[PDB]
Design a protein around this nucleic acid. Sequence first.
DNA 1: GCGATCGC
DNA 2: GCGATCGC
Length: 66
Amino acid sequence: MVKVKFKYKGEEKEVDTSKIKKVWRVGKAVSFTYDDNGKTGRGAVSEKDAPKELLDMLARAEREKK
DNA sequence: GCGATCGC
DNA sequence: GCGATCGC
């Protein structure tokens, strides 16, 4: 499958892109929210660390219209 | 500070 | 409403 590896307040997680909910660019980073077993988690990676799948999801988000 | 959110 | 949070 495709997991994104990231750090958040220490906890170095690696979430299934299928659990990613929203993705957006903040500066040169790719930020996102994800389903964290019911809660909404937050993560961000540098673009070089972002697997293509996440960048595909980002491009999809970037094409969204009103 | 940028986006966007959570968690308070 | 905003600090923390991520990368930078």
